[PDB]
Every structure is written in structure tokens, then in C-alpha cells.
Amino acid sequence: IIRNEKRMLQEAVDAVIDNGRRGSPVTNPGSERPLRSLTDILSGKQGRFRQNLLGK
Amino acid sequence: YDGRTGEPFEGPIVVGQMFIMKLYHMVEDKMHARSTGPYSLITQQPLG
Numbered sequence: 001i002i003r004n005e006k007r008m009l010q011e012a013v014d015a016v017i018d019n020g021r022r023g024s025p026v027t028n029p030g031s032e033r034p035l036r037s038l039t040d041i042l043s044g045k046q047g048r049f050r051q052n053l054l055g056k
Numbered sequence: 057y058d059g060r061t062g063e064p065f066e067g068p069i070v071v072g073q074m075f076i077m078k079l080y081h082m083v084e085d086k087m088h089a090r091s092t093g094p095y096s097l098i099t100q101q102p103l104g
Binding site: 052 | 099101102
């Protein structure tokens with residue numbers, strides 16, 4: 001049980017950082033769109049560096 | 057001729073009936089300008 005939850009810790013935690021760079025991404029319960037994590041806000045064409053700070 | 061002057065035009069100009077249409081986009085709607093409005097809750101940027 002220990003290894004089970006102790007590992008679920010690493011997967012959840014790392015999911016809050018980059019969701020989907022390791023294993024299938026986690027989405028809102030029962031629906032579709034994968035939760036946008038920290039690293040998911042930075043990268044991408046709409047990243048805050050672009051859609052907000054390099055143009056607004 | 058020229059309704060402004062009354063003198064004709066050096067060359068001839070084709071004319072006559074044609075079918076045209078006023079498209080959806082009308083400045084009456086699209087045209088806009090703001091001064092200080094609401095801002096995106098996250099960052100204080102304005103709204104498209």
C-alpha cells in the first residue's frame with residue numbers, strides 16, 4: 001500500500017508541474033480537456049510570455 | 057458627362073445594370089474604440 005500511494009505522490013506532484021510529459025495526461029474527472037499545469041502555462045504559442053508579456 | 061462640371065469625358069465609359077450585394081460585415085457593428093475598460097482577471101490586460 002505504501003509503494004502504491006508513495007508512487008501516486010510522485011505522479012500527482014509531477015502532474016501539477018508538467019501534466020502529460022510523462023504518461024497519459026490527467027483531465028477533469030469524466031470529461032475531456034487536460035488540466036493546464038505550471039509548465040503548461042509557460043510553453044505553447046499562448047504561453048504567458050507571448051499572449052501576455054510579448055504582446056497584449 | 058460630368059455632373060460636377062458638365063464637360064464630357066475624353067474617353068467612353070461602360071455602364072448599365074449589375075447585380076451587387078451588401079455583405080454581412082458592416083462598420084456599424086465592427087468599428088470600436090475604448091478608453092479604460094474591464095481587464096482579464098488573471099493579468100490586467102484588456103479584452104479582445
